[PDB]
RNA sequence: GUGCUGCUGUCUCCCAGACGGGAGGCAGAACUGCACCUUC
DNA sequence: AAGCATATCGT
DNA sequence: CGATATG
């Protein structure tokens, strides 16, 4: 089934027995060795229970007379490893009054009426018992009234606080068979044959980043009015009507301050390492002394003192200033939700990632300064500090999780608003990137799971040359390095520019809808006589060679203008397509550099910008 | 409920030691904001 | 590894 | 509808 969980708090033996159950399953048994094999089989199974009682060793003495139910419940809990209360453990009666729950555990001694602290997850809940041994909860996590079914409850104790896990089933939104057939059609290579969707679906091309948290483009099959036209496999062209950029920088000053402080904390650790070398060794190597003066001093924004005694004092003053600036930045980041800026605060912004990078850099700087004392041979000790920078780590993990949840919610919202039912995302599996903050697959897994729960199917497209190829001419352009938000291409021999993220979003959507009709790069090797044999590993390359040459293999034969061509063969060096001539690696880079030189002389003022 | 997520006063513990940093406990002031399958 | 179903006897 | 017992 599909499950969702949240906790409620109840304020005013089951563990004594849960711990006993865990230990018993792992480890009255007067001669445990003599019955070791059976015990092991039963514990591993958690029919065995029936066999154990026949042996006459299965009855035991529970820490606290749990009679039955509670007993079996805790047993199953330890197994799975939550003192559970089932309705088919001791039965419970979950009701709701006002804005809070009321759990009534039916213990053998009597009824235990427990009121729960009003949660903002199960806000304003309504509970009605069903005929299927369940409770139908209706709550508010807008005023969307989420619905769930509760059949089992669990009790735990954290820091002397008792918590109830309301693990409830829910029904994901209905997904049409047209969406499934359309995904099957569009995901398949051109070699295979799949039925057409035969419906007017909606496709959302998505590019993921950190500064533009994500950008999207929307297309509707069989509906082309105005926008960047894209071919569709075996159908008519479609126009990307809604193209947008979500996320982004909230306030420029805050982003700049986080970047500056992250750089300062990045260089501080290396500066104190070099100062520790200077205080101990007394001299530096040629590279380090050049590195310290040229890079570390202007980076840490410190004044280099020759005296080693007051060098530590200057370093401590600098670290105090760094911490004061960090506290100011954190307070300004907190105030986005507690001023008149409540309305203009975005769901997700570029500061959610800059703050994480700053937290990591400051953690490193503080961990380095705290160990400024150590000298030759101190190293690390089994003990020392058992909770060093615990608050920092807690904040980093909590902010990471919250950023992931808010990004997933933003993506899902944007997909639902635009009516999309198919979402082509970029396969980020294939610093200043989403990686080094999360696992490459974790973000994708979360996003597709939430989209599926909302009834939207998602597919990962190969993200190769999407940010370097124009979405109109389907040719290589210039991605500006001074400003990474402008992508320069040529059209009718006139240089145009576009947003470099909606460009990649449209390229992702185009690759999805055209079923990878065109490839911008081919891997080949030189056999002899200037003939570059094409290396075919992916099925997409096999389909591409069939459509252009006519055979599942081909070679690059040279021409006069340092270019190549596809021929085809009857039965490892990159090559970039360019204008149908398959320029080699060096010539492709030369062409890109020529484009960059041409666009730098022209000036962006005379370069028109297309709709975005 | 869990976080985003902090401020002020005061107190305790630790590492340098006399420039500073890291765990936490209470008491207050402001805020009605966003998101959340937890659990192992 | 987890976060229940049916089935009939007896009263 | 309660008491087990097993899909």
Name the 3-class secondary structure at A475: coil
C-alpha A271 chain-centroid distance: 33
CA A547, CA A302: separation in Å to the nearest integer?
Answer: 63
Q: How many angstroms separate the CA atoms of A156 and A5, rounded?
A: 14
Range A297-329 burial, b when 16+ CB lie within 10 A, else e = bebbebeeeeeeeebbeebeebbeebeebbeeb
A109: tokens are 């001694």
Q: In Å, what resolution does this model reach?
A: 3.4
Do strands A422-426 and A457-461 pair parallel, antiparallel, or not at all (unpaired)?
A: parallel
Distance A584 CA to B5 C1' (A): 54
- List the single protein residue with the shortest CA to C1' distance from B2: A7
Cβ neighbours for A267, distance < 8 A, ≥ 6 positions apart: A295, A296, A299, A300
> B8 C1' – A391 CA distance, angstroms?
20
A242 Cβ contact partners less than 8 Å away, ≥ 6 residues apart: A216, A217, A218, A418
Alpha helical stretches, state H, A371-469: 390-417, 440-453
Walk across the sheet containing A422-426 and list its strands. Answer: A243-246, A214-220, A202-208, A422-426, A457-461
Residue whose token pair is 């550099």: A593
What whole-number distance in Å separates Cα of residue A410 and Cα of residue A347? 7
Residue A440's contacts (CB-CB under 8 Å, 6 or more residues apart) are A428, A429, A434
Kindly list the domain boundaries of chain A, sorted by start residue.
3-169, 176-242+418-516, 252-375+388-394
Q: Which residues, including other chains, have CB under 8 Å from residue A572's CB and lie 6 or more apart?
A: A523, A524, A525, A535
Burial of A459 (0-12, 13-18, 19+ CB in 10 A): middle
- Which bases of chain B come closer than 7 Å to a protein CB? 1-7, 14-24, 30-31, 33-40
- Give Cα A201 to chain centroid, integer Å: 26
User: What end-to-end distance do the CA atoms of chain A give, in Å?
Assistant: 42
Cα–Cα distance between A476 and A592 in angstroms, integer? Answer: 8
Beta-carbon contacts of residue A273 (< 8 Å; ≥ 6 apart): A368
Residue of A338, A470, A353 lying closest to A404 (CA atoms): A353
Q: Across-strand partners of A145? A: A140
Q: Looking at the C1' of nucleotide B20, which residue has the nearest alpha carbon?
A: A316
Which helix (H) or strand (E) element contains residue A153? strand A145-158
- How is residue A515 annotated by DSSP? T
Separation between the CA of A88 and the C1’ of D6 (whole angstroms): 13
């Amino acid at each position: 089934p599909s499950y969702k969980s949240s906790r409620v708090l109840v304020r005013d033996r089951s563990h004594r027995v849960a711990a006993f159950f865990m230990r018993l399953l792992l480890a009255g048994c007067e001669e445990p060795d003599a019955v070791s094999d059976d015990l092991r089989s039963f514990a591993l199974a958690v029919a065995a229970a029936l066999r154990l009682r026949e042996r006459g060793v299965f009855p035991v003495s529970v820490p606290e007379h749990l009679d039955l139910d509670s007993l079996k419940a805790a047993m199953a809990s330890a197994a799975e490893r939550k003192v559970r209360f089932g309705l088919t453990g001791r039965k419970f009666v979950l009701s709701a009054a006002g804005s809070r729950f009321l759990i009534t555990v039916k213990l053998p001694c009597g009824d235990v009426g427990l009121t729960a602290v009003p949660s903002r997850y199960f806000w304003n809940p309504s509970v009605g018992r069903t005929t299927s041994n369940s409770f139908r909860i209706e709550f508010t996590k807008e005023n969307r009234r989420y619905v769930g079914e509760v059949k089992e409850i669990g009790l735990v104790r954290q820091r002397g606080r008792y918590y109830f896990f309301i693990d409830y089933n829910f029904d994901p939104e209905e997904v049409s068979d047209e969406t499934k057939v359309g995904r099957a059609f569009f995901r398949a290579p051109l070699n295979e044959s799949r039925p057409k969707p035969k419906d007017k679906l909606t496709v959302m091309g998505i590019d993921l980043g950190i500064n533009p948290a994500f950008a999207f483009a929307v297309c509707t099959l069989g509906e082309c009015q105005d926008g960047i036209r894209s071919p569709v496999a075996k159908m008519e062209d479609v126009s990307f009507d809604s193209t947008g950029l979500r996320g982004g920088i909230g306030s420029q000053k805050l982003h700049r301050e986080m970047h500056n402080l992250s750089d300062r904390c990045f260089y501080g650790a290396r500066y104190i390492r070099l100062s520790k070398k200077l205080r101990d060794r007394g001299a530096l190597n040629d590279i380090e002394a050049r590195l310290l003066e040229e890079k570390y001093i202007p980076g840490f924004r410190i004044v280099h003192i020759e005296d080693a005694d007051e060098r530590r004092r200057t370093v401590g003053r600098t670290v105090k200033e760094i911490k004061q600036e960090y506290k100011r930045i954190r307070h300004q980041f907190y105030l986005r939700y507690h001023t008149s800026k409540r309305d203009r605060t975005e769901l997700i912004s570029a500061e959610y990632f800059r703050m994480l990078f700053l937290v990591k850099n400051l953690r490193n700087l503080l961990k380095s300064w705290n160990r400024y004392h150590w000298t030759t041979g101190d190293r690390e000790r089994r003990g020392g500090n058992p909770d060093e920078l615990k608050s920092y780590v807690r904040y980093y993990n909590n902010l990471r999780m919250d950023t992931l949840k808010k990004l997933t919610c933003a993506i899902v919202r944007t997909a639902k608003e635009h009516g999309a039912t198919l979402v082509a995302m970029e396969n980020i599996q294939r610093e200043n990137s989403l990686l080094s903050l999360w696992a490459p697959g974790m973000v994708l897994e979360r996003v597709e799971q939430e989209l599926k729960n909302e009834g939207i199917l998602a597919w990962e497209v190969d993200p190769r040359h999407t940010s370097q190829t124009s979405c109109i001419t389907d040719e290589f352009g210039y991605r500006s390095l001074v400003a990474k938000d402008t992508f320069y291409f040529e059209q009718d021999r006139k240089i145009h520019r576009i947003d470099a993220d909606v460009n990649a979003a449209i390229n992702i959507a185009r690759r999805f809808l055209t079923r990878y009709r065109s490839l911008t790069q081919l891997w080949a090797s030189l056999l002899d006589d200037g003939r570059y044999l094409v290396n075919v590993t992916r099925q997409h390359e096999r389909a591409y060679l069939e459509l252009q040459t006519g055979a599942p293999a081909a070679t690059l034969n040279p021409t006069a203008e340092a270019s190549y061509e596809l021929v085809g063969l009857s039965p490892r060096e990159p090559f970039y397509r360019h204008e149908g001539v398959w320029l080699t690696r060096e010539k492709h880079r030369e062409q890109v550099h020529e484009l960059r030189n041409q666009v730098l002389a022209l000036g962006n003022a005379k370069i028109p910008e297309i709709r975005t």
